[PDB]
Design a protein around this nucleic acid. Structure first.
Lengths: 138, 159, 36, 204
RNA sequence: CCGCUGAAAGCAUCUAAGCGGGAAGCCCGCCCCAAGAUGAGGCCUCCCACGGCGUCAAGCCGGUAAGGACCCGGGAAGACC
RNA sequence: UCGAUGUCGGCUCGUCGCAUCCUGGGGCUGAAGAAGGUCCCAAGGGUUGGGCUGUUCGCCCAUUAAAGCGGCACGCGAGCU
RNA sequence: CAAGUCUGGGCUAAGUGGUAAAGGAUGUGGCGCCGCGAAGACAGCC
């Protein structure tokens, strides 16, 4: 029996922006990084994930007609409290929110699921307000 | 076409002439740079999309050329009794049976002319614009009212 | 006007798809149809 | 956006042209601007004014002499007045002219644990015919198995009043500079002696 | 819903490239809540020291500082809070 | 579901659907004007007070811009009748 | 969410896929077979 299992992993920072990238097809990769899943210590119960800084958000391309068409949704607990917002407008404001939402949904839903999400740092930009290393990934 | 000048850029094509310049925005399914003592356009793959664009692009460019060597044109006949028009600065105060006359400020690179008091014409380098503006005027009081009153192109009514 | 069977009503009338929808336009406006 | 801290003093009516016009008097003592927010450092722009002068130097942590007229900072504290940036040494009532229109904000009277049918005007039960412990009660509050719950926001009984209220577009009827006084079209939130703020209106 | 310009389709077409109009409806604007917005934000101003002991900064007690509680007089605040 | 799921209507409180009764757009009209008809888009807001019947509904009186039709266990009796 | 953002060839532009019919349509693509064209009108001004 081997408990190959690691001792506190020295986490990685990464800068990433294919500004003209399909969201999702980006977001999918982001997530993989967020769980230490490229790395061969993958440890499911732990968060030995990376830190991922998306710069130059907005810009994200997307296929077919998904402005006025993709519709983001918020139910405030009230009567009549569904809100529907086209993607146009999300870009038009809170563009940094578009990429985030897409990534979130692809991470696991528990408490760790939540904790990894906070290891993702998204900026419509560029310029990323933390110089703390950043092996840029392409 | 003579005193007029066609350069080429990526998705753009610039047409200078005696009356002004215009940019025609054009599809990259084409390889058109200043060509001959005239100007031609072709298209790749005989597909749906291309076939359509070809000929469109032809025309857009054509109407851009006529523009710059004078292509003003376009004229409106106002009909009915009390109705008439009147130039004011470069604006138009046509009075057409509403209780208060309708003033029409001119957009950029366009000139109204009030030859008569019941004829009006729109000057312009463009054509898209001209044609629009004339519409906006017509709309002020479209015609048809079991006949006669209102404002008309040179196109004509049906009993 | 708004019917699930739009057809040509006359030879001046004309069938036109615009913006997802099948219309018809004649010279005379009684002939104007839109599919729905 | 003009505006000044002030105190509701109470109301009467005067006569205009030849008609009785009810007014509430406001005392808008001059208001020492004690900080200015800029967009540069604070993000947004406004002016923090002060009001009720007197104070036995109870200034402890907010010594904040910092701005000229730190003149022992006001009892009734100090508030901002959003987009507003004037003659940086006090705000009088000369600010306003008669005729002008203003929005007034203050504190509605504290009604305590209100019934429904006061908090909300509900219909209440019949004074007779029908049984007898449901006269001021609210009736039903739902359906049944679907949705099997009460909705958020249901008008119900509780703490009512003692809350901010902005009544809008009041006529300024007269301004007494001499006394820092101010007359308007009567009926402004809150009780007499009570704090209010007084801004140019929104019909433009 | 109405148009401008406009091919595929020498004509025609509000449309396939583009461009204008257009609803008490959608978004913002107005009023009120709102950073437990654990993503817990900003600005102003204040008090600053180890004094004694662990594995060496509390995971340390004991006095403190700016400040804050308790107790008391009350209040168009309030069931109590 | 019979070792119990109170079973019409009324009141009180609502909230939703649109197949829209007003109000806002609009195209046809056997549309002169005014007023209709018909279909299309549109619930944001509104959608009265009485006589008769337990009534639902309905008919009637007087109004109205209008006097919509439905769902919520024929919504709602640990809320009342 | 374990294992292919695997290879080769097509369709489709509706988010169709992501659940409905009679019936409508110069929406697309692929196979067919005839009209009939220097007795040079298929569409556009004599």
């Amino acid at each position: 029996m081997k408990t190959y299992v690691p001792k506190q992993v020295e986490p990685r920072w990464v800068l990433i922006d294919a500004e003209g990238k399909t969201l999702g097809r980006l977001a999918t990769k982001i997530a993989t990084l967020l769980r230490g899943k490229h790395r061969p210590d993958w440890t499911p119960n732990v968060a030995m994930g990376d830190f991922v800084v998306v710069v130059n958000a907005d810009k994200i391309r997307v296929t077919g007609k998904k402005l006025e068409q993709k519709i983001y949704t918020r139910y405030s607990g009230y009567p009549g409290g569904l809100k529907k917002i086209p993607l146009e407008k999300m870009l038009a404001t809170h563009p940094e929110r578009v990429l985030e939402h897409a990534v979130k949904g692809m991470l696991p839903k528990g408490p760790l699921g939540r904790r990894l999400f906070k290891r993702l740092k998204v900026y419509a930009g560029p310029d990323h307000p933390h110089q703390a290393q950043r092996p840029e990934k392409l | 076409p003579k005193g007029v000048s066609v350069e080429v850029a990526p998705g753009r094509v610039k047409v200078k002439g005696p009356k002004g310049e215009l940019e025609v925005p054009v599809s990259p399914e084409m390889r058109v740079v200043v060509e001959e003592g005239v100007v031609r356009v072709e298209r790749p793959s005989d597909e749906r999309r291309h076939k359509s664009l070809h000929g469109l692009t032809r025309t857009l460019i054509a109407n851009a050329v006529k523009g710059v060597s004078e292509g003003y044109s376009k004229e409106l006949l106002i009909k009915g009794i009390g109705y008439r028009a009147r130039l004011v600065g470069r604006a138009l105060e046509l009075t057409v049976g509403f209780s208060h006359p309708v003033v029409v400020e001119p957009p950029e690179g366009i000139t109204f002319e009030v030859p008569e008091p019941t004829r009006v014409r729109v000057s312009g380098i463009d054509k898209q614009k001209v044609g629009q503006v004339a519409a906006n005027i017509r709309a002020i009081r479209k015609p048809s009212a079991y006949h006669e009153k209102g404002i008309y192109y040179a196109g004509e009514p049906v009993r | 006007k708004v019917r699930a069977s739009v057809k040509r009503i006359c030879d001046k009338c004309k069938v036109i798809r615009r913006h997802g929808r099948v219309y018809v336009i004649c010279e005379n406006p009684k002939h104007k149809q839109r599919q729905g | 956006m003009k505006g000044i801290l002030g105190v509701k003093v109470g109301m009467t009516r005067i006569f205009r042209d030849d008609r009785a016009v009810p007014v509430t008097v406001i005392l808008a003592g001059p208001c020492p601007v004690v900080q200015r927010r800029t967009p540069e450092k604070d993000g947004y722009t406004a002016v923090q004014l002060g009001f009720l002068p007197q104070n036995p130097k109870r200034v402890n942590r907010p010594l904040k002499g910092h701005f000229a007229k730190a003149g022992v900072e006001p009892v009734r504290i100090l508030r901002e007045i959003r987009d507003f940036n004037p003659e940086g040494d006090t705000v009088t009532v000369e600010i306003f002219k008669p005729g002008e229109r203003v929005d007034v904000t203050g504190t509605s009277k504290g009604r305590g644990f209100a019934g429904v049918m006061k908090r909300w005007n509900f219909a209440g039960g019949p004074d007779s015919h029908g049984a007898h412990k449901i006269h001021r009660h609210p009736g039903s509050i739902g359906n049944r198995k679907t949705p099997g719950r009460v909705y958020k926001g249901k008008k119900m009984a509780g703490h009512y009043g003692a809350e901010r209220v902005t009544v809008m577009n009041l006529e300024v009827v007269d301004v007494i500079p001499e006394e820092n006084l101010l007359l308007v079209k009567g009926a402004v939130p809150g009780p007499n002696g009570g704090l209010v703020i007084v801004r140019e209106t929104k019909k433009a």
